[PDB]
């Protein structure tokens, strides 16, 4: 068609109509969010991990929906830039492989990268093993692991005292990574995968663009081992993505079913069935 | 009420209590001896658990040093135009091998840390059993001295009563003779 003016007006009117429908669709989801996740996490606790590129509003939305599900958030641990860049790998492993490991607790000896080892030790400190034979970590023992990782600049956490044990975990990232920040994808994907066996399930949640390499969600989906260990959400920036974090966390705690959700590359569906 | 038959029966009841306290002193002395032995075995176990911990701590110290020594070779190796192209070519050729050497040393180090972790828990359990053994030896020693003081108290009461019975029997035989002589 060579009617360029009438094409611009028609396309502007189509785009504006879809924007209105989309605002209403997102408002529908906010208003029924508590109905969707009703009793999804009753009696259960979640520990939240967040990366430097994660958005405050996503963490707050996940934490609000956890509460709507009848669940509690034990703490929000921020993984510092010193951890995710992976340039302090040996300093990290010298802290993890020290007497800070609670007495009698055993570190995994399979993967020795700093991401896997940090998630393994923080899984011991902050999560409850689905296996009753595994040790129950004391409050003083958990605080020791946390203070050592905070003095060495790997983590930041709220609240600073009396953090309880959690059933499951969410690791929240931002969107797409710049190629120069590619180390952050692998370190956080391995970090998230090592938390999976230490509790009742880990979900790795990212904003739009996280399903593209080199982001953690994409690194997870492309690695057969990690894609089988943790669940992922690639659109935590949107309300359907935030609701799916809780619905897929429910699936992990009750049955251990792993899925890859959202609108991006490698997502098997938008949400759980 | 003040008859010699009643006084004799009073000595017999007091002496039965004294016999019972003597029997408790002997039984509690055996408990102190048994507890004394339990303390020495628990203290030996705690000293053996400290040796297992020291051995595992040394092994951790060695594993950490082997990682540091591998990193020192890789760092010193990295440290002229055609010579610098050759250093980079050699380092890039051996890169994946250096990673595999390091992964092997890191895994070995975690395995030593896990052995030390188990040993730390065994040392804490052995110390708790040694402290619980001492708590029992102390509770048995204190119970023995309490029965020993009740025994000493009863032995003096039995001596007092037997001295009265002996004096009354001596007075009875003397009074019988003064009456019999008249």
Residue numbers in the entry:
A (entry chain B): 41 to 313
B (entry chain A): 43 to 121, 137 to 239
Text of the article:
D,L-endopeptidase RipA is the major PG hydrolase required for daughter cell separation in Mycobacterium tuberculosis ( Mtb ), as RipA defects severely hinder cell division and increase antibiotic vulnerability. Despite extensive studies, the mechanisms governing Mtb RipA regulation remain controversial and poorly understood. Here, we report an integrative structural and functional analysis of the SteAB system, a regulatory complex that has been shown to modulate cell separation in the model organism Corynebacterium glutamicum ( Cglu ) and is conserved across Mycobacteriales .
Although Mtb SteB was previously proposed to act as a mycobacterial outer membrane copper transporter, the crystal structures of the homodimeric protein, alone and in complex with the RipA coiled-coil (CC) domain, rule out this hypothesis. These data, coupled with the in vivo phenotypic analysis of a steAB knockout mutant of Cglu , support a model in which the transmembrane SteAB heterotetramer, driven by cytoplasmic ligand binding, orchestrates the productive periplasmic positioning of RipA, leading to PG hydrolysis activation.
